[model samples]
Every structure is written in structure tokens, then in C-alpha cells.
Target: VSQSQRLEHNWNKFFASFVPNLIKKNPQSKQFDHENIKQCAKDIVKILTTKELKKDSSRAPPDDLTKGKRHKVKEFINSYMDKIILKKKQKKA
Candidate 1:
């Protein structure tokens, strides 16, 4: 597999590791302790998020890239993954 694919796969696994505890605390409830779980999610996101990968000059997408945008990927990945994956898992299970 390519470098990007590897990175993405590893990231998915890293996030999946939290599934059990996330459910343990919230139990898929709309009225659950959102703040607490969100905090934990935020902490995990912060730790998982980083911009130390490829340089924009080397790995820029179909468009131009900058440090700000680089970190934005990390931000978007963290937020989007948490919202979509975590919420869906809780909702489904």
C-alpha cells in the first residue's frame, strides 16, 4: 500500500481503540454526559492530531498547501471522525 493509505489505516485503528470506553461511559444516549465524553475525545484528538507528516512542497494535494491548511487536515480529521464515527457507533450499538 501507499504511504497515505498506511497513515489513514493506522489512524482509523487508533481511533477505533476508544470504542469500548466511549460506549461504556455514554451507552449511546442523547442525554449522556456529552461534555465528559467530548473532553476525552478532544484529548485523544489532540494527541492523535499532528502536522509532522509530509511537507506541503512535497505532498501538496491537487491544490496549493500551507502550514495552516496542513494542520487543518488534522483538525478536520479529528472533529469529523469523532462526530461521524463515534456518534454512529454509539447510535448503532
Candidate 2:
């Protein structure tokens, strides 16, 4: 398969497998419906390929940009999820 197809397939499998489990584990966040998660996964690809993210100088470079575009896609997805998922507390007024 071509590199782009491989990247899509890998991410397809990842969100297909993981998002449902995430909802199950965090029933409180029923807001994270399956389709939303799937779209979020899709957006990661869009965000990484855009010039805006590439031009940013604050973040360190990946281990090697020569590896494959998919590597950067996967890294961004993981980082995005890390920032968004897994809450430990709730606020109370």
C-alpha cells in the first residue's frame, strides 16, 4: 500500500478500536461520542500537514522527519489526545 493509505489505515484502526473503549471507561464523558472521536482523529491528519504547525519553532523536532509523514501524524495524534483526554477531577461551584 502507498504511504498515505497506510497512514489512514493505521489511524482508522486506532480510533475504531480505542475510542469505544475510551467512552466505556469514562462514562461520565458521554460527550465523547464515537463520531466525534473519529472526526478528531481525522483532524489530526489535517492539522499536521498544514504549514502552520510545521513553522512553529517552540516544539522540538521529531526524532527524524525523514522517517515518513505518517510518523509526524501519529506523533501529533498522540500529543493531541494527551492534551484532551483523561481528566482526574471536576470543578464545583
Candidate 3:
């Protein structure tokens, strides 16, 4: 497999693997304190409604710009990844 394909597969796995374990660790506790459970819920809400993520997704770009932008972004990301991989190889040698 190509470097790009390997990177994409690994990135996908990295994000997907953590989520189930994160949820498992942060489960409900009914034995005692309501304040602790409430705090956990508040923290989750804060993450879900974070400002940076909210700002970027508030408006849709124009149709003509969207496709062009997405292609350019993929190019930029692939370029950056290529540089990172090259740096790693050079560091080892």
C-alpha cells in the first residue's frame, strides 16, 4: 500500500479506537454525588458546543468555492504529510 493510504487508515483507526474507551471511562455513577455527575454532563456539553468548531461550521461556502477549496485542502494535507514522512526518514538516516 502507498504511504497516503497507510496514513489515512492509521489516522482513521486512531480517532475511532479512542471514542469507545473514552465513553467507557466516563460512564454514569448513580451510587452517590449528583454534583459529580452533573459536572461530567456539563463538561461533555462544553466540548460539544466548543467555540472553534462552532465558528467554522456556522456558514456554508458557495457551491463554486466548496469543491475548489476541498481539493486544495486535500492537496495541502497530502503535501504536509509528505514533508512529515520525509523528515522522519531523514532523521533516522
Candidate 4:
């Protein structure tokens, strides 16, 4: 794919994956509401790719939890993607 195509493909996949996770975590939050999913998805990609989050995400935060988890919780309104999708898939097996 060309660079633009590649970028668009990634953006589409990321939001598709990201929104469902957000819905799981904060089902009642405005961020998790139907109207907000796309906007929330874009915000999520923005935060995750920002310089500060990129720098700190691999490290531990104030708690023993990884900065990654903190960002995940903030960036997503619900369970993590793996938590929501993987567990759901396993349940059907």
C-alpha cells in the first residue's frame, strides 16, 4: 500500500478495536455513548501517540501498575481490547 493507504488502514483498524474497548469500561460515560465513539477513538489515538505518553508508557507509574495500563484506562473507557474481545471469544468456545 502507499503511505496514505497504509495510514488510513491503520487508522480504521485502530478505531474499530479501540471503541469497543471503551464501551466496555465506561458504558455510562458520555465518552462511551454512541455519538462519541468516533471522536473518542480519535482522541485515544492522539493521546497514545503523544510524546509524553510515549515516553512514560513502558515504565511503571506511581503504583506498581505499568504506565501503559494507566494510559489504557484513560484512553479507553472500558476494559482493555484484549480483555473485552478475547474473553468474549473464549466464552463462546
Candidate 5:
């Protein structure tokens, strides 16, 4: 269980590592690549909604964003994953 949980702890790292790759590597495909973007959103919600995985992030998305704004966090979670990933490539700019 510890081994599985240990990797679980690092899931965010893996997301940062490859999410950048996924977005940058395929700027075009992201249009239809709902799964990757959705996965990215889910990962972020995983963090903010709690300290770790295993929570109701899926539920929180619509409630918070569509809390009537029609504009909301899920949209940025997708964009901001790219933001967080972008900085990984460089900083102090």
C-alpha cells in the first residue's frame, strides 16, 4: 500500500512533467483532446480541493465555476496547467 501511495503522492509531479509535454507537443490536437485537458483539470482540482487525491473534484467544477458566472475555474485549470507547466521550463524572466 505504501508503494502505491508513494507514487500517488507524486502524481502531481508526473502531471507537471508530462502535461507540459502534452499541451506544447500538440497545440492543435488539444481542440479535440478533451481527455488530456479533462485529465489536467481533474489533477488541478485534486490539489486545490484538498491536500491529495481522492475527493469530489468532479462535483466541485460545475458548482464553483457555473456558480452562475458561466465563467469559472475549470477553464483556467486547463489554461493554468499550461501556466504552471510553462514556468517549469524557465523562470526569473
Candidate 6:
């Protein structure tokens, strides 16, 4: 896979890693149709990666399932990736 493709793959894998636990936390999340979640994950990859390169910084934020749940999921994903990146770097060091 190319660099960009691999990077998005990692992000998708990372999202899948904790999604079940997330669902357990709020079963209501189950209402989010699989295809919806699938699209949301792809969008997440786009938002996080292009953040440094893309110029449109003020994209209108929308709910992810729900407003309360939306913030929680996004924040957790950010922290989750941050922690994963640290451990990966340390493993090579």
C-alpha cells in the first residue's frame, strides 16, 4: 500500500479497536447503522490526517450519533491514536 493508503488503514484499524467497547458503554450507539458508522470512520480518517495539510479548518462540526456522544467519541479517538503512536515509536527506540 502507498503511504497515504497505509496511514488511513491504520486509522481505520485503530477506530475498530475500541468501537465494541464504545458500543458497550452506550448501547444506544447500536442505532447507528453499520453503513453510517462505516462512513463516519472514513470521515474521521479524512479529518484527522488532512488537518495539517487542508486549509478548511472551520468545517462545520456535526453530531456523531448524538451531540454528547459525538464529542466523547472524537476525543477518545484522538487520545487513543496519540497513545498508540507513542507506543509504536517507543517499540522501535
- Better model by TM-score: candidate 2 vs candidate 3: 2
Q: Indicate whether candidate 3 or candidate 5 has the larger lDDT.
A: 5
The per-residue C-alpha lDDT of model 6 at residue 11 equals: 47
List the candidate 4 regions with Cα displacement exceeding 4 Å: 1-19, 24-26, 29-32, 51-93
lDDT of 6 by residue, 44-86 (tens): 5465545522434333333233666457666865564445445
* lDDT of all predictions: 0.46, 0.45, 0.38, 0.46, 0.45, 0.50
Model 6 scores what on Cα lDDT? 0.50
Q: What does candidate 3's lDDT look like per residue over 1-93, in tens digits? A: 444433433333433333223333332232213443343334332332233235543322222324564465335434533454456557778
Candidate 6: where is the Cα deviation over 4 Å? 24-38, 41-93
1-93 per-residue lDDT for model 4 (tens digits): 334434444544554454446454564343334334544566555544343335654322223224575566554544434344445457777
Give residue 35's error in model 1 in angstroms.
27
User: Candidate 3, TM-score vs. the true structure?
Assistant: 0.30
| Candidate 3 vs 5: which has more TM-score | 3
Lowest summed lDDT window (length 10), candidate 1:
56-65
lDDT of 1 by residue, 44-64 (tens): 433342233333213323232
Clashes of each: 0, 0, 0, 2, 0, 0
In candidate 1, stretches whose alpha carbon ends up further than 4 angstroms from where it belongs are 1-62
Model 2: per-residue lDDT, tens digit, 1-93? 445434544444444443344434453235454544665556653454333334642333233324464465556655565445443112211
Worst-scoring 10-residue span by lDDT in model 5: 57-66
